Amino acid sequence: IVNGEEAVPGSWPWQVSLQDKTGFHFCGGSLINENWVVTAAHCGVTTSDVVVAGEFDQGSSSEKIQKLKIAKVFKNSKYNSLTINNDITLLKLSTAASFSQTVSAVCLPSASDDFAAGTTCVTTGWGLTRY
Amino acid sequence: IVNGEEAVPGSWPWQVSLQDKTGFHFCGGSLINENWVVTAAHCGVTTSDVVVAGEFDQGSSSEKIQKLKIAKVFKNSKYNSLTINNDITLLKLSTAASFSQTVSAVCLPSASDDFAAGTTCVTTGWGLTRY
Amino acid sequence: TPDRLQQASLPLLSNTNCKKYWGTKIKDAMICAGASGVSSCMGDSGGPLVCKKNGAWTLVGIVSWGSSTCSTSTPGVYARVTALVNWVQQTLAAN
Amino acid sequence: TPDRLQQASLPLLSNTNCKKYWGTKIKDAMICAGASGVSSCMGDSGGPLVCKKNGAWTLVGIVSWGSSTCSTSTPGVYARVTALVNWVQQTLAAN
């Protein structure tokens, strides 16, 4: 995030980090329950990638983080790589996440929900802070 | 390909088409042998996607094409989604492709090979013809 | 790339207003936000764009794409969850 | 999107010359080609950029990225196979 700020540790419990086997953070995601995380289809997550939960500082070795394995990747059948439309992919975890004060689920809207233009919402992540 | 031309049918035997379960062509690939196809890491291929070989016209129902299933996806551990560097992924086929006049393998260069600037090479595909 | 989790609040825009920056690339299953002095950037993809509805944070969008230099002056583009939630329900319900 | 397989021949460029169009995004495991009146475009990704060496077509690059409007005036960017072939050999040799 460019021009963002540091979050309070553990305040966005659903935020997970998708890392490859190298340990490299390549995409973020959100826990929707103990067995499912939602991310972008264009991240290209495979089953050899890992989902890290309860993490705040990627440089800390003293955080009680959860390294969860992916059982199966579910790419939205409507996903269009040419237009990047319907960019959503579900991850079924082989290992179930254990919810705690720092690990829990974000809510999903109903198909009917409307969020008016002008509404101030929030986005989180470990993406570049400046290009 | 913009400003390309139509190829002779079956003249690029290694060219495969990655399609999702919907039948949608989303990325191309190259057969490197009867059990392995090479594609881009950013295509985000999963095991529910299909590899079509021996195909020339995606609109024809009378071509003897091979619909091969993917056993495992191997994303280059050095792949960088932020820079799109080391954009290569190997696909191990559950079903082995059967080579014929229209289906065969492209050769790989040795790490030592040099291809001089100015050299005229070729690229093929079913990507958009105009944006 | 930051070691510690970042956050930023930003306004949601209408697709028609967003089409002024992005044109025809803005599809219906997309929702823009930003052009407010902050911007999602590379490595944030897949992450949440949450809005608080009735006391709880609800997943409204998923970081997809936007400006190549992460310009804080142009809106980022997120997958619109309302247009996708039915597929999520179906997928969870069958596995 | 064409129903029938397309083809096009195009010149290879040096990374230093390509850096004039793309700047620092051009990494070592990348190789450019084009800016010749033809251009790979969306949907071509993953496909081959073959060069004929000693009578046989050898995989030189894999369609990755380039211009957002597929401008035939700017070079496309392909993954450079020579920088990746050792990983392919290792992967095939262990499975």
């Binding site: 990047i84 | 932020l82 | 794409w65 190549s68 | -």
Partner: peptide, 4 residues
């Protein structure tokens, strides 16, 4: 990129 272009995608994040």
């Amino acid at each position: 990129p272009g995608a994040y």
